């Protein structure tokens, strides 16, 4: 039965060191993802190893080799808009980034 | 003393510190069922369907 | 035999030839009447379109404290057009509608009372052929 | 000009609809627990549908309250009637009947004209809040108030005044001097009485007058029948009865064979709900128009052209009807 | 003898951090306001 | 509505992609896509109807501002109860408040 608890049997792979403050795609015990890592002032309970949100997306992890409280937040998104006069009058444009 | 357990449905109140300081049963009286369906700890005036 | 909407309601007996009618077994909804919980905790329960001589069995009558139809016998039983109401008493006055039930019945928390709504006060104006008012 | 004539016309508008409610699980899965377990995988569509239907249900009571509740006192009519030759017998309540309705309302009530299946599959009809007796009481109060006082009970306390003086004042409101009415009283009264009689005669002999409300009733009936007829379709499965599928195959195939029916019935319910909302919008617009007309043609004299009647407006009276109202100008 | 136990025995359902929300759980619990026999 | 199964073996795309080979993952993804599309369509329809209602209210408010604030109205029960004299506007979040 798939991972519903701390893992016990694992296949052969190579571990890698830990970084922060850059958008990365990681593989935690078979759990794939993408985002950035930082530090949370709120410390987990002694028996808590996962964090979720309303839409059931993983939030925070406690590393399987060393004990920390690290958060996940996907790197920034947003839309793009273009301001132009009539194409029959000129050819210059301006760009706006939302929030 | 000796107690017993049975299957139920519960609504748990979590706070910022992750402590279950309150929890409301779901089959005790009509008010608990109304709270379960509305998903809140206080109910205003009216007539609801359960 | 069948009906205008494809439903079947008549079946013949295959041993002693006779006709029988088929009627759906009862079902309905449950509503709760609560004054604001900031003020009190008493409630009332309404069952739709059923005789309440038949509601110790409509719901299975199993609960620690039943849904304030406390093993649903006792006083406070009223039969209206919308069904039977348990948990309120009948009065012979008229006031303004606080919470509507249906077909002219309104319920208010003073316990809980059920009454018929009043449209207003009564006024009679003197009419003649040589009188006015300014 | 040299002469004049007094005319009376009719106008009909619908107000409210019928209040229905449908239960998802009984309509879709009947009473089979496996179908409910399968349906538990689709989220919260059914709470949405029930919420929409309840929202539609409260609005009809809202509309009726907006239309028929304008005064907060109940006015009586004197037992002695001498209005200078004016005969109001065809619109006043009749005490020699258990219903207390005017003859015109009695005529209107008699002109407007699957049951187990609705009771079978989870379809219910909710009763209204105001009975017809209360609406009749409201109408009689309005009529008595306008007969005895005029436009003065819509802006404060009621004040008494004889009817001929009110008619003279209304004549003064359109540009004709008062002495015209005082020298032609009997002719005007006779024209009024003849017009009322002709109105009743024309109503009681042409059935093509009350079509607007019949249209709404027929539309609702057709929609419900179309909804009920859809429970006998395959949509792709080998049958339409759940019990046969359960008794013929093992669960792995019954899974998909039930999924097809679940999807089809969900689609049908969605279509029904959308059509109901679209109808309710137009009903509400009609109700708002009727409320404005009642405010502006019954409690005062209007200067807008072709709003209350056809010509120069003098006064109007309300009447009750099934799911609607009738105006006489 | 018999003894009442009003609100006791609630345990943490799982091992996931949840922050200031209201949640729905289906699990075995001690019913509220139960008679607890005393020996 | 993003936590549902719709018949698929799970609800997380990466979980499905990390277990199987493309053809079956295609079927599961198809089920998920169909469900989510239906949800989005329902939301859009409801929003359109509510927008129509709000537009009707806004038109009524514009007419009331035009007729009662600028001039004296002879219509019964349009601007207040009784005989109308004058009116004043005030601003509220997402609306307007009138004084008669
Ligand atoms: C205006 O028309 C009316 C009819 O609508 C006329 O009323 C008639 O007047 C004559 C005159 O003596 C009477 O004999 C009749 O009994 C009246 N009624 C009818 C139905 O004919 C009225 O006369 C006309 N106005 C004028 C100035 O002649
Ligand atoms: C008011 O008009 C009605 C309408 O005709 C009159 O009712 C008639 O009254 C007579 C005498 O009482 C009866 O013989 C008729 O059968 C009635 N017909 C109808 C249709 O009601 C009524 O009499 C008039 N009022 C007065 C005071 O004369
Ligand atoms: C506790 O004992 C009383 C004694 O009669 C009984 O009525 C009740 O059902 C029992 N259980 C409770 C209160 O939960």
Q: How far is C47 from chain E (nearest CA, A)?
A: 27
CA distance A41 to A68: 11
CB contact under 8 A, A44 and E12: no
CA F79, CA D155: separation in Å to the nearest integer? 12
DSSP state, residue D174: T
Chains F and D touch (3+ CB pairs under 8 A): yes
Interface with F, mutate which of D38, D42, D47, D66 (most F CBs under 10 A)? D42
Report the half-sphere exposure of F43 (CA within 13 A, side-chain side): 8
D232's CB contacts (< 8 A; 6+ apart) are C6, D240
Chains A and E touch (3+ CB pairs under 8 A): yes
CA of C64 to the centre of ligand 3 (A): 8
Structure method: cryo-EM
Q: Which residues, including other chains, have CB under 8 Å from residue D286's CB and lie 6 or more apart?
A: D13, D14, D15
| Residue matched to tokens 């190579």 | A14
Burial of F59 per CB tally in 10 Å (0-12, 13-18, 19+): exposed
In the DSSP assignment, the letter for residue D209 is: G
Residues 1-39 of E with CB under 8 A from A: 12, 15-19, 21
Chains contacting chain A through 3 or more C-beta pairs under 8 A: B, E, F
**CA D227/CA D271 separation, integer angstroms:** 9
Whole-angstrom Cα Rg for chain F: 27
- Answer whether D123's CB lies under 8 Å from D20's CB: yes
Nearest listed ligand to the Cα of residue B3: 3
Residue in chain B closest to C68 (alpha carbons) equals: B29
Cα A69 to the chain's mean position, in Å?
14
3-state secondary structure of D311: coil
CA distance D141 to D163: 17
Q: Name the DSSP letter for residue C70.
A: G
C-alpha–C-alpha distance, residues D213 and D286, integer Å: 12
Residues whose CB falls within 8 Å of the CB of residue D6, separated by 6 or more in sequence, listed in order: D188, D191, D192, D195
b (16+ CB within 10 A) / e for D165-182: ebbbebbeeeeeeeeebe
Cβ of F11 within 8 Å of Cβ of A56? The answer is: yes
Q: Which of B8, B26, B45 to mutate to test the interface with C (most CBs of C within 10 A)?
A: B45
D137: enclosing H helix or E strand: helix D132-148
Residues in Cβ contact with F95 at an 8 Å cutoff, skipping those fewer than 6 apart? none
What 3 state SS string does A62-75 have? CCCCCCCCEEEECC
The bridge status of strand A27-28 relative to strand D317-321 is: unpaired
**Nearest alpha carbon to residue C45 among D45, B16, B29:** B29
Q: Which two tokens stand for residue E30?
A: 């001690």
Is the CB of residue D241 less than 8 Å from the CB of residue D221? no
B18, B20, B39: residue with CB nearest E10: B20
Give the strand pairing for C89-90 and C112-116: parallel
Which residues, 6 or more positions from B39, have their beta carbon under 8 angstroms from its beta carbon? B11, E22
How far apart (Å, rounded) are the C-alpha atoms in residues D227 and D221? 10
Stated resolution in angstroms = 3.1
DSSP string across A31-91? EE--BEEEE-SSPPPTT--EEE-TT--EEEE--SSS---EEEEPPP---EEEE---TTT--
Q: Which residues of B touch A42 (CB under 8 A)?
A: 16
**Cβ atoms of residues C102 and C81 within 8 Å:** yes
CB-CB neighbours of A66 under 10 Å: 7
State how far residue A53 is from chain B, nearest Cα, in angstroms.
Answer: 14
Q: What angle do CA B34, E18, F4 make, to 5 degrees?
A: 70
For residue D90, the cross-strand partners are: none
């Amino acid at each position: 039965e798939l991972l519903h608890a701390p893992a016990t049997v694992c296949g052969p792979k190579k571990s890698t060191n830990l970084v922060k403050n850059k958008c990365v795609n990681f593989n935690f015990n078979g759990l794939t993802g993408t985002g950035v890592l930082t530090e949370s002032n709120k410390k987990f309970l002694p028996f808590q190893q996962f964090g979720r949100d309303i839409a059931d997306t993983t939030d925070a992890v406690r590393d399987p080799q060393t004990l920390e409280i690290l958060d996940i937040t996907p790197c920034s998104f947003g839309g793009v808009s273009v301001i132009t006069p009539g194409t029959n009058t000129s050819n210059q444009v301006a760009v706006l980034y939302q929030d | 003393y000796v107690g017993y357990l049975q299957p139920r449905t519960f609504l748990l109140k979590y706070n910022e510190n992750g402590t279950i300081t309150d929890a409301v049963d779901c089959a005790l009286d009509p008010l608990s069922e109304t709270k379960c369906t509305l998903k809140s700890f206080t109910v205003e005036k009216g007539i609801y369907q359960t | 035999g069948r009906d205008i909407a494809d439903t079947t309601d008549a079946v013949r007996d295959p041993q002693t030839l006779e006709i029988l009618d088929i009627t759906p077994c009862s079902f309905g909804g449950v509503s709760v009447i609560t004054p604001g919980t900031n003020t009190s905790n008493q409630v009332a329960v309404l069952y739709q379109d059923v005789n309440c001589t038949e509601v110790p069995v409509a719901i299975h009558a199993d609960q620690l404290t039943p849904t304030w139809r406390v093993y649903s016998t006792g006083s406070n039983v009223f039969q209206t057009r919308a069904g039977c109401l348990i948990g309120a008493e009948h009065v012979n006055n008229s006031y303004e509608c606080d919470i509507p039930i249906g077909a002219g019945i309104c319920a208010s928390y003073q316990s809980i009372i059920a009454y018929t709504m009043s449209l207003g006060a009564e006024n009679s104006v003197a009419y003649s052929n040589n009188s006015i008012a300014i | 000009p040299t002469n004049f004539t007094i005319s009376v016309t009719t106008e009909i508008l619908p107000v409210s609809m019928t209040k229905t409610s449908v239960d998802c699980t009984m309509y879709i899965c009947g009473d089979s627990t496996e179908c409910s377990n399968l349906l538990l995988q689709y989220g919260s569509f059914c709470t949405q549908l029930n919420r929409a239907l309840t929202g539609i249900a409260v609005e009809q009571d809202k509309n009726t309250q907006e239309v028929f509740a304008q005064v907060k006192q109940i006015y009586k009519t004197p037992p002695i009637k001498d209005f200078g030759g004016f005969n109001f017998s065809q619109i006043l309540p009749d005490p020699s009947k258990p219903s207390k309705r005017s003859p015109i309302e009695d005529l209107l009530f008699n002109k407007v004209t699957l049951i187990c299946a609705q009771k079978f599959n989870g379809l219910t009809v909710l009763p209204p809040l105001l009975t017809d007796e209360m609406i009749a009481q409201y109408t009689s109060a309005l009529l008595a108030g306008t007969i005895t006082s005029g436009w003065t009970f819509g802006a404060g306390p009621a004040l008494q005044i004889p009817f001929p003086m009110q008619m003279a004042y209304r004549f003064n409101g359109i540009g004709v001097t008062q002495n015209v009415l005082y020298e032609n009283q009997k002719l005007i009264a006779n024209q009024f009485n003849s017009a009322i009689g002709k109105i009743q005669d024309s109503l009681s002999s042409t059935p093509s007058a009350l079509g607007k409300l019949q249209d709404v009733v027929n539309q609702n009936a057709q929609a419900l029948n179309t909804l009920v007829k859809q429970l006998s379709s395959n949509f792709g499965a080998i049958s339409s009865v759940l019990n046969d599928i359960l008794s013929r195959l093992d669960p792995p195939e019954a899974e998909v064979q039930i999924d097809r029916l679940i999807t089809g019935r969900l689609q049908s319910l969605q279509t029904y709900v959308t059509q109901q909302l679209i109808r309710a919008a137009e009903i509400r617009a009609s109700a708002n128009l009727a409320a404005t007309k009642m405010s502006e043609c019954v409690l005062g004299q209007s200067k807008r052209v072709d709003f209350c009647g056809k010509g120069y407006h003098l006064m109007s009276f309300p009447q009750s009807a099934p799911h609607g109202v009738v105006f006489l100008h | 003898a018999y003894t009442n136990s009003f609100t006791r025995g609630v345990y943490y359902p799982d091992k996931v951090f949840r922050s200031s929300v209201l949640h729905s759980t289906q699990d075995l619990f001690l019913p509220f306001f139960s008679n607890v026999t005393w020996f």
